[PDB]
């Protein structure tokens, strides 16, 4: 029993993190095979960061201007190129700790683990969700750019996120591993607006099912509802509208608990209008939306990885 915000084991990723320095600017890089990936703004000074022309900045940058450290090991850069918003540093040594990996682009609502690093050294691991406005609610300080988000499936590490910057509202934005930003953001120190953040409804429902699996049943009422009637109430509380495909994804959790999805929607609608009346659900006084239906099955059935 029990339910925790659980992250993937980070061992396979820790052995890929390196420190990248260009002049006085340092951040983290991802070392796979003989290539190091890092945010391209490593080539900026503090003055270039408001209106950087990265093509102009590359003119006075050579291979020997990049210093790459894998702990005590020094890596010699023998090539470099800019690909979208990341730099690809070709180094003289293939990473012997390279795992089986893929580059994946995630969609809003999906979750992943973040290995936060400073000076190429790990600091901590935590789990987060890609918000519907393409930000993440992370924990990052200056020097953390280049930290990566990942999932593990069977034996393969799936890299999905590389950290770049923090938005004024305290949320974070980054790219996939091809260098393309999540959301309508650019890597310069300008005022940039993100969309309105909404609550991921299918995830809240999966977390309510996790509650029932662990013995929390006080919020189950006698009501039912329809998709249209629920979505009418949901849109007022800034919830993403539920679709039929969301109902299908929740099928196995509904079958396991014996609670029809539309009955659970009725229980959620009451929690929205009436609150939780001093009770808690899985130790939380708020409705949690950073667990996917697959996350719940995984934690509640003991899925392990290589």
């Amino acid at each position: 029993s029990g339910f925790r915000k659980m992250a993937f084991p980070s061992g396979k990723v820790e052995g890929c993190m390196v420190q990248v320095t260009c002049g006085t600017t340092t951040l983290n890089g991802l070392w796979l095979d003989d290539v190091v990936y890092c945010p391209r703004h490593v080539i900026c000074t503090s003055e270039d960061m408001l209106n950087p022309n990265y093509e102009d900045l590359l003119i006075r940058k050579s291979n020997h201007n990049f210093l790459v450290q894998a702990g005590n090991v020094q890596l010699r850069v023998i090539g470099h190129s800019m690909q979208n918003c990341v730099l690809k540093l070709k180094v003289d040594t293939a990473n012997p700790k390279t795992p089986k990996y893929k580059f994946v682009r995630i969609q809003p609502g999906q979750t992943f683990s973040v290995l936060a690093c400073y000076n190429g050294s790990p600091s901590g691991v935590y789990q987060c969700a890609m918000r519907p406005n393409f930000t993440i609610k992370g924990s990052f300080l200056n020097g953390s750019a280049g930290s990566v988000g990942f999932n593990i499936d069977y034996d393969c590490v799936s890299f999905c996120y590389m950290h770049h910057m923090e938005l004024p509202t305290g949320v974070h934005a980054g790219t996939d591993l091809e260098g393309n930003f999540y959301g309508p953001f650019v890597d310069r120190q300008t005022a940039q607006a993100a969309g309105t953040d909404t609550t991921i409804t299918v995830n809240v429902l999966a977390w309510l099912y996790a509650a029932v699996i662990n013995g929390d049943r006080w919020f189950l009422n006698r009501f039912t509802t329809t998709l249209n009637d629920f979505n009418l109430v949901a849109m007022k509380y800034n919830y993403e509208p539920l679709t039929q495909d969301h109902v299908d994804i929740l099928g196995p959790l509904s079958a396991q608990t014996g609670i029809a999805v539309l009955d659970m929607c009725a229980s959620l609608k009451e929690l929205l209008q009436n609150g939780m009346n001093g009770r808690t659900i899985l130790g939380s006084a708020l409705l949690e939306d950073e667990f996917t239906p697959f996350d719940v099955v995984r934690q509640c059935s003991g899925v392990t990885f290589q």
Binding site: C44, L141, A145, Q189, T190, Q192
Partner: peptide, 8 residues
């Protein structure tokens, strides 16, 4: 503004 989170 947005802040690029490199270190110095």
């Amino acid at each position: 503004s947005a802040v690029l989170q490199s270190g110095f």
